[PDB]
């Protein structure tokens, strides 16, 4: 995993397109090189180690682009996590106050999160095999396993989205309807992070109370996502973010 | 910056977005047209009725935050607003809730919009 | 030796820097393309023989 982070910028701001052609060329030559553009004006390079970045900038400055470039000093990329279970519900009802989502969060135990990263328990399983794995491996509850909704940031991410609100959980109609954008907002909040805007790691989210607009029309459809995101961030923050 | 007028270049009391892209507070821009039918953004003379409003939320501290994502606005943030709406959101939320979907409506209300009605008033990448 | 040859910047903003360990001349020489702006006529040392 490339964790070392290096920001790059030309000396004469006139020279930005040539630099961008350079960054393309180096992306073509290097298999794991990651490049990004940070909103705050930075073209950022992600690599694995000092020698790796040295030879990247060698190929950049000498052969692909003979433009003159300043280079910021390296840093690492961080993750964000929690140590503890959320203490109260912060809960978002969409702009038109039609759907309310209460959801709280907690830290995952290493074993699972590393298993999810290892793809041991890939969610392309059916719920049966998921529950088998889970109840067996981590003293997991079985209704919990049936409640295991998603894994978040992308196809495999250390985070885990699980809903537990039984009697109204038997509103599986509008639930089963909106769960898609619910998980879309989950994925967004998890890729985007509250603290540093860095990928969050090793977190469990539990949707505990979902009020849904009857016939959750475009109201629910569009407006629910940012609501779900604020829900994620608010639980996370509310009881105990960490780097 | 975001919250600064252009005829004055100091903090803006009631923002009134020009259809071209320059915000300018009407508490100033009224007299500028009453004495010169041209705007300061371009000495080419222009309409006054074209002035759209702009409605900027505030947080527990009152800072002008975007509506949907609650991100406190800074001097690098890209801020686009819906001319058909009058409310200002972050370019990220406006796009990836109206670019990922096809629903070129409003996000604060259900107001449908024209996909040409988003004006991006401040974006460092330009 | 004598120096071979002899404005504003936005990176250098010190409020943005994370200073853990002070960058020394050994580092700037070991990795002359990563710790160095304007490297001209720089030979690349490395060996692990």
């Amino acid at each position: 995993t490339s964790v070392i982070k290096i920001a790059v910028e030309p000396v004469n701001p006139s020279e930005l397109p040539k630099m961008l052609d350079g960054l393309r060329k180096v992306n073509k030559s290097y298999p794991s090189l990651t490049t990004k553009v940070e909103e705050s004006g930075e073209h950022v390079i992600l690599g694995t180690g000092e020698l790796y970045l040295d030879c990247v900038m060698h190929d950049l400055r000498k052969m692909y682009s003979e433009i003159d470039i300043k280079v910021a000093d390296p840093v690492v990329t961080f993750c964000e996590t929690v140590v503890e279970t959320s203490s109260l519900k912060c809960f978002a009802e969409t702009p038109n106050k039609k759907n309310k989502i209460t959801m709280i969060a907690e830290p995952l135990e290493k074993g699972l999160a590393e298993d999810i990263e290892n793809e041991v328990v890939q969610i392309t399983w059916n719920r049966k095999k998921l529950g088998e794995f889970f109840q067996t491996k981590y003293d997991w509850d079985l209704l919990a396993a049936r409640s295991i909704w998603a894994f978040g940031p992308d196809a495999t991410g250390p985070n885990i989205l699980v809903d537990d609100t039984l009697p109204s959980e038997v509103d599986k109609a509008l639930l089963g309807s909106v769960k898609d954008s619910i998980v879309q907002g989950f994925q967004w909040g998890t890729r985007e992070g509250p603290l540093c805007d860095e990928l969050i790691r090793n977190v469990k989210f539990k949707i505990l109370d979902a009020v849904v607009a009857q016939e959750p029309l475009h109201r629910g459809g569009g407006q629910i996502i940012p609501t779900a995101r604020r829900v994620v961030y608010s639980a996370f923050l509310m009881a105990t973010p960490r780097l | 910056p975001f919250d600064h007028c252009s005829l004055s270049l100091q903090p803006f009391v009631y923002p009134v977005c020009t259809p071209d892209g320059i915000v300018f507070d009407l508490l100033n821009i009224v007299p500028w047209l009453k004495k010169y039918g041209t705007n300061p953004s371009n000495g080419e003379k222009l309409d006054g009725r074209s002035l759209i409003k702009l409605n900027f939320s505030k947080n527990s501290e009152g800072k002008y935050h975007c509506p949907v994502l609650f991100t406190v606005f800074t001097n690098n943030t890209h801020i686009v607003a819906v001319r058909t709406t009058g409310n200002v959101y972050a370019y990220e939320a406006v796009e990836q809730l109206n670019i990922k979907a096809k629903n070129f409506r409003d996000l604060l209300t259900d107001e449908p919009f024209s996909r040409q009605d988003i004006i991006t008033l401040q974006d460092p990448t330009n | 030796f004598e120096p071979l040859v002899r404005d504003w910047n936005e990176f250098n903003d010190i409020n943005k820097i994370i200073i853990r360990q002070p960058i020394r001349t050994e580092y700037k020489i070991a990795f002359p393309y990563l710790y160095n702006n304007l490297p001209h006529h720089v030979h690349l040392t490395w060996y692990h023989t």
Binding site: E39, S40, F78, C196, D197, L243 | T74, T77 | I18
Partner: peptide, 19 residues
């Protein structure tokens, strides 16, 4: 010193990009 590298890193990263 040790107790506050997290405060320092988050502040610096936000002043760098996130504001």
């Amino acid at each position: 010193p040790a107790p506050h590298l997290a405060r320092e890193f988050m502040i610096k990263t936000r002043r760098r990009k996130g504001l």
